[PDB]
C-alpha cells in the first residue's frame, strides 16, 4: 500500500516546457569574478553549510554580504547559483552581485548584495499590525515570482527575511536548499527548518511542491500576530508534528494520512493523542490584540492546513482581504 501521487495546483509544467540548460545545473558551468575585489569586514552567521560576513567591495567602497562555502559537493553549488541567476531581478529576491573562489577556505564564495537588516528577534517585537500586512505581502511576491519559474525555496523562515525597516525593504535569502519543481518527482523530506517544516516533510511525504513554503510562510505569519516566535515550537522532528497537531487537532492530521495513504513511522503512535482542533483566538492576549484580526486569522487559516493540496497559492493569498490596504503600488 503506497502513498498516492500528487501534484502542484500551480506551475505544474513551468520547466517542463523550458530549456533543459534552465534547469539542469548539473551541467552548468561556473564562471568566476575576482575574489581581490572584496574585503571581509564583520561575521555575520555560520551554518553547516557556510559563514557569512558582511564585506565591502574595494573597487567602489560598496558594500556587500560574502557567504563562504564549505565543503559540499559541486551539484549542490551550481544548483544555488543556477537557482540565484535564474530569479535575479525577481520582486525581493536577493541579488547575487558576484561569484569568487576563497583561496584561504579554498571554497566558493558567493557575493550577494547588502540590505541593512534588523535582527527579527528584535524587529517584530516592533512590527505593527501594517507592517506585518506588509512584509507578508513583500514576501509572497518573492514566493510567486520563484514558484511561477518553477522553483521551491525550501527554508522559509524569519532568519532568511532580511529587513531594511526605515526603507520597507525586504529581500528573500538563503537558497541553499532551493530546488527545481518537476511534477511526479519525489523530494528528499530533509529541508526547511525544524520549526517550519510542514506535515508533509514530518510524515514524510515525498511528493511535494511550492505549497510547502506557504505553509512555512503560515508559521511565520502565526510567530508574528502572535508575538511567539516560533509558534509551533517542536523538541525534534517528531514532537514538531506533536506542537501542530495540539493545535490544529488530530482529526484532520490522520484524515490527511488516509488521503495519501502516508504510513506514519510507528514512532509517532506514542506520542500524538488525541487532540481537539483549537480556535486561532485561543493565541489572542491583551500583548498581541492589537496585530489579530478576522481577515488575519481567515487567512492565517487557509495557510496553515495539513492538506499540502488545499493550502492557499502565493497568487491567491495575495487576493486575501487581509491585503486590501497594504498601499497598493499604483504609484
Ligand atoms: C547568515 C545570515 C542568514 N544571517 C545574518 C545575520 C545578520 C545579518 C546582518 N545583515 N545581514 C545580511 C544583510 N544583507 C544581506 C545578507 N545576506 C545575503 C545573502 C545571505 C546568505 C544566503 O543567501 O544564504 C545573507 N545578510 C545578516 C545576515
Given at each position: ?18 530549456p533543459?540548460?534552465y534547469?539542469?545545473?548539473?551541467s552548468?558551468?561556473?564562471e568566476?569574478?575576482?575574489?581581490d ?11 553547516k ?18 557567504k563562504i ?10 544548483r ?6 535564474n ?6 529576491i536577493?541579488?547575487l ?10 571554497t ?5 548584495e547588502?540590505?541593512?537588516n ?26 510567486d ?16 527575511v532580511?529587513?531594511d525597516?526605515?526603507?520597507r ?15 511526479g ?9 525544524r520549526?517550519?517544516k510542514?506535515?508533509?516533510?514530518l510524515?514524510?511525504?515525498?511528493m511535494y511542491d511550492?505549497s510547502?513554503?506557504?505553509?512555512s ?12 516566535e516560533?509558534?509551533?515550537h ?27 495513504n ?11 493523542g ?15 490584540q ?22 492557499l ?5 495575495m ?13
Open positions: 500500500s503506497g502513498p498516492v501521487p500528487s501534484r502542484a495546483r500551480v506551475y505544474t509544467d513551468v520547466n517542463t516546457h523550458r533543459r540548460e534547469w539542469d545545473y548539473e552548468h558551468v561556473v568566476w569574478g575576482n575574489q575585489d572584496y574585503q571581509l569586514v564583520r561575521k555575520l552567521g555560520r551554518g553549510y557556510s559563514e557569512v560576513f558582511e564585506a565591502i567591495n574595494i573597487t567602489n567602497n560598496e558594500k556587500v554580504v560574502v562555502l564549505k565543503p559540499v559537493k559541486k551539484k549542490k553549488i551550481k544555488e547559483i543556477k537557482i540565484l541567476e530569479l535575479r531581478g525577481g520582486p525581493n536577493i541579488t552581485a558576484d561569484i569568487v573562489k576563497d583561496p584561504v577556505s579554498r566558493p564564495a558567493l557575493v550577494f547588502h540590505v541593512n534588523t535582527d527579527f528577534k528584535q524587529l517584530y517585537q516592533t512590527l505593527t499590525d501594517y507592517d506585518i500586512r506588509f512584509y507578508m505581502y513583500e514576501i509572497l511576491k518573492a514566493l515570482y520563484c514558484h511561477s519559474m518553477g522553483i521551491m525555496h525550501r527554508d522559509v523562515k524569519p532568519h532568511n532580511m529587513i525597516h526605515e526603507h525593504k525586504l529581500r528573500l535569502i538563503d537558497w541553499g536548499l532551493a530546488e527545481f519543481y518537476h511534477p518527482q519525489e523530494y528528499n523530506v530533509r529541508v526547511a527548518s520549526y517550519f510542514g506535515p508533509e516533510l510524515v514524510d511525504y515525498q511550492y510547502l513554503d506557504m505553509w510562510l503560515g508559521c511565520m505569519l502565526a510567530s508574528m500576530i502572535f508575538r511567539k516560533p509558534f509551533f517542536g523538541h525534534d522532528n517528531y514532537d514538531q508534528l506533536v506542537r501542530i497537531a495540539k493545535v490544529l487537532g488530530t482529526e484532520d492530521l490522520y484524515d490527511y494520512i488516509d488521503k495519501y502516508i504510513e506514519l513511522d510507528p514512532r509517532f503512535n506514542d506520542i500524538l488525541r487532540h481537539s482542533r483549537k480556535r486561532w483566538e485561543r493565541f489572542v492576549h491583551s500583548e498581541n492589537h496585530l489579530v484580526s478576522p481577515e488575519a486569522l481567515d487567512f492565517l487559516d487557509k495557510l496553515l492546513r495539513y492538506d499540502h493540496q488545499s493550502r497559492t502565493a497568487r491567491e493569498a487576493e486575501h482581504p487581509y491585503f486590501y490596504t497594504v498601499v497598493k503600488d499604483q504609484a
